[PDB]
Design a protein around this ligand. Structure first.
Ligand SMILES: NC(=O)c1ccc[n+]([C@@H]2O[C@H](COP(=O)([O-])OP(=O)(O)OC[C@H]3O[C@@H](n4cnc5c(N)ncnc54)[C@H](O)[C@@H]3O)[C@@H](O)[C@H]2O)c1
Ligand SMILES: NC(=O)c1ccc[n+]([C@@H]2O[C@H](COP(=O)([O-])OP(=O)(O)OC[C@H]3O[C@@H](n4cnc5c(N)ncnc54)[C@H](O)[C@@H]3O)[C@@H](O)[C@H]2O)c1
Ligand SMILES: NC(=O)c1ccc[n+]([C@@H]2O[C@H](COP(=O)([O-])OP(=O)(O)OC[C@H]3O[C@@H](n4cnc5c(N)ncnc54)[C@H](O)[C@@H]3O)[C@@H](O)[C@H]2O)c1
Ligand SMILES: NC(=O)c1ccc[n+]([C@@H]2O[C@H](COP(=O)([O-])OP(=O)(O)OC[C@H]3O[C@@H](n4cnc5c(N)ncnc54)[C@H](O)[C@@H]3O)[C@@H](O)[C@H]2O)c1
Ligand code: NA
Ligand code: NA
Ligand code: NA
Ligand code: NA
Lengths: 267, 265, 268, 267
């Protein structure tokens, strides 16, 4: 297996459409031993994670909760064994209140909403790394999920701003993680049908949300030289597992695109 | 003059070393009529702005204060005249608590501090645009100050993250401002000796060595050199973007850094 | 009162009154600059075009593939501008890629000799022109070239896009050399400006599928641009070039300034 | 193995320091069956390829030679078997005449020299793809070697221009290759001590250029959060093998950095 014998923490499962669910699934198929975290809906997440190929312990983690973060490393050590450390950590956590996305006016998002979105979507990448690095092996790998924010675009609005901040945070986490021999990278994915993608069509009434998703998928698949399927998270999941493996050992502070090549083409 | 007859709002003057002070100075030399804003120490700012070439009214604006923002357009109209609008707006506002910069470890910056820095340095570019666009002419220009955050740097830490956010905010502000014929752009300046940039740093030998190497390297990398004690080239570049001479540039970043960012060594 | 008052500026690249260089020259003269112009090959026709400019200007022959033309250019410039005078600005507005490299053949089928010629004219010659003119440029001068954003692949533009990527790299090295004598070097990345060659593709020169793609590509600029984009109006591009020729961007070099309506900053 | 059962063409071996030699070594260790090509010094390359873990046929290929390119597919088919195709192709080919490098003035490099370097280092990435795509399986992978040309550098001079052109070529190759389900990507490596740059490193293209190359290497390891070892091509070879594998299946037209993270850091 690609990740045989590696112990990996996977955040961000909420439904079995979640990108983290497919990251966790491929990682287990490739021999990894997982620890999972879940936010808020722990009973529902526990049932969801039973659909994964192999059993894995589930820990509660709200990245806005400094008590959760401060106890996380010790809670991880309790489940993986006294003398054991993590080899990989997956950040697959994002949120932006409704006012910050969809057809809602960009100028009308109140700061309290945008700040919450920045906290969960960008600041928390530093928060999670700070919490887990003490229980990470040298040679380890932290990977976060990104959506290319180089250019502005409709509907993504303030979540785009949060991703721009996340990219910057990743470069600084790589400085800290490198002091202990750990890599830090983002995977910039093309669009995937998840709960997150439903936030993007927020405000659309009627068949508008469906047709907006149709236009998004059509244009992405068109630009991508090898095509793009928003219903298939497996290629993104594999890319994350590639970064969690030992096969990109000189890549850190970086962004690896898993978008079908769409961002390299203009029409 | 380059800005003859243009009415321009300039935020961010705190001393005569402020970048906004030199922007305001050059803009007046080039025929512009200015309105200034000031945060917190208004009595001191009023006296400092008397050093500018020409008089300009001063309005209070704390960009975290929604009442200040919501009244700003009406307060601008009171000073420039009933039937008049602004042609330009300069955002030269930046702040990050000490926990988010310097020798303070990146991981130890509390969220409340970083959020305040994000508010003042990135979110407020949108807030300011929202407030002034109703009293801006078509063909107008909004310019903000940037420091290239494409790569991580020691000591700048969370201020670099805020600048990464600011670049993204500018691209979305350009979409809103473009609806009314207004451009929005950032000037990415090389390092300048100001109060805000001195906050980034006295604080031990590691911080001292980091900044010397940053400054040493910037003049070295820049093909035409870089003078950290001279804000004039940055001020002129902002005036270039306020003028009518870059009329098809918006949502963009213009570098006034000696060309340093184009060179590796 | 002119943006370029008293400045002596060399403008290459005029072939018709649609040439971007023609509009650069027009605005620069309107802003008080004194121009020297260059033209390639059929100078008698180019001279009739340059008579349409607001003010008279000498025209010098320059084939940028001809090293004798390049080696004699500085002296020929000095002869027309006066013994003790130098240039303040230079505009490179020169580009060409043979048809095989811009869609008439598939990308893989363009012969190297054609592509090499396009690279020579469109990228290498920015270095060649800088070498030739820098001896007669004042400190504080400015060299500006024309770019078409090559960050992403596009239909039909093919090897010309490769040439522009090369030109962007050349500009960064010219900035190193020019900076030694106090001269800035920059590119203006313009949005598309209507031409006969690309109009032919939109007319169905490369078939109906390629025609639709080129038109969609062009239309997309005005759509993406937050302030719109007018493919028939080179004046905003001309003004931006004059802005880089002025003294108002004095700390910008090795760089790329976009005059594209903001299109490249937007994804839809 | 990461490349088990895959047939891969590797260009660019000249000595056992070549990046291509280490790509070949790791690929064979990971189960790949290789075909190798060599330019000009075929007796030397034959001996060099005997140092690899496993035997591999060696084919002559001068990428400036259109006859070599036009016969290449058939010569590949002859050695891999009638009904078999390639799964991967590695372009590890670069050259710029001395006039285009070192202390030799950038403005003085004659066009004939720069055009030759452009042909070998950038155009031939398209030429090789054109030549090999007819004998490539769907789902295959083409990988070329890049040196980040986003910013100008001492001594690399016109080779940096060639790399900027190569990055553009890669995006158009990805378009064409994507039509038949093949990916095309570059690996931007940190500096590695190889034959091509040895004279510049040794001061033979000026004492100043030698000094600047040392400063470049020192700063590269300094910037890199996980360090950079200019004598160790293994992390680069592994990254190329990662792109040849099935684990980055949604990445094309792209550039993957194997540089210690140096390019993401300013000091
Ligand atoms: N779906 C796409 O098109 C897309 C594209 C690129 C990147 N991404 C990114 O991938 C990541 C995963 O999103 P997804 O598409 O799988 O959607 P998702 O809704 O399934 O996952 C988002 C996760 O964030 C968690 N989360 C929210 N607030 C949290 C908090 N306070 N503490 C801890 N966890 C919290 C949620 O519980 C959920 O598990 C996000 O960063 C998203 O922005 C998504
Ligand atoms: N100094 C540099 O090296 C450098 C480089 C590039 C860009 N910049 C940017 O230029 C801008 C101006 O900074 P400077 O270097 O002139 O420093 P400065 O300290 O002189 O100016 C910063 C200004 O921000 C104002 N400000 C802070 N909090 C505010 C609030 N709540 N509401 C309104 N205004 C508030 C201050 O009153 C001050 O006038 C900032 O955006 C800074 O990030 C600075
Ligand atoms: N038209 C657009 O959409 C567009 C967009 C962006 C950039 N540009 C660039 O702007 C520049 C000007 O192009 P244009 O649109 O005005 O087209 P154009 O055909 O009018 O100008 C190209 C010029 O190059 C000259 N030239 C060609 N070979 C030469 C040689 N051997 N020696 C000297 N001069 C030579 C031609 O005589 C002509 O004057 C080019 O670099 C072009 O790539 C054009
Ligand atoms: N060494 C580094 O620091 C570095 C960094 C990044 C990328 N790269 C790139 O990696 C690739 C491999 O170079 P290297 O450093 O391993 O050096 P090398 O000297 O070991 O390999 C260069 C190869 O190019 C081949 N080549 C030259 N002309 C050719 C032609 N006409 N036809 C076919 N092959 C030809 C040579 O035979 C040789 O095998 C090059 O593209 C180089 O630019 C190298
Ligand atoms: Na496609
Ligand atoms: Na310098
Ligand atoms: Na538009
Ligand atoms: Na280091």
């Amino acid at each position: 297996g690609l990740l045989e014998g590696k112990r990996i923490l996977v955040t961000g499962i909420i439904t079995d459409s979640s990108i983290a669910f497919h990251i966790a699934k491929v990682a287990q198929e490739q021999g990894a031993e997982l620890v999972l975290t879940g936010f808020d809906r722990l009973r529902l997440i526990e049932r969801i994670t039973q659909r994964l190929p192999k059993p894995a312990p589930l820990l509660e983690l709200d990245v806005q909760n400094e008590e959760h973060l401060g106890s996380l490393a010790g809670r991880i050590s309790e489940v993986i064994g006294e003398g054991n450390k993590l080899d990989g950590v997956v950040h697959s956590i994002g949120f932006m209140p409704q006012s910050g996305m969809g057809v809602n006016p960009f100028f009308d998002a109140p700061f309290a909403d945008v700040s919450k979105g920045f906290h969960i979507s960008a600041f928390s990448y530093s928060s999670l790394a700070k919490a887990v690095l003490p229980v990470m092996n040298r040679g380890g790998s932290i990977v976060g999920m990104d959506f290319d924010p180089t250019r502005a675009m409709p509907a993504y609005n303030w979540m785009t701003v949060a991703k721009s901040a996340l990219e910057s945070v990743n470069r600084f986490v790589a400085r800290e993680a490198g002091k202990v021999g750990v890599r830090s990278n983002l995977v910039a994915a093309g669009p995937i049908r998840t709960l997150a993608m439903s936030a993007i069509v927020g405000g659309a009434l009627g068949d508008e949300a469906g047709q907006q998703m149709q236009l998004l998928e059509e244009g992405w698949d068109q630009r991508a030289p090898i095509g793009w399927d928003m219903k298939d998270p497996t290629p993104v999941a594999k890319t994350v597992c590639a970064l969690l493996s030992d096969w990109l050992p000189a890549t850190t502070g970086d962004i690896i695109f898993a978008d079908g090549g769409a961002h390299t083409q203009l029409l």
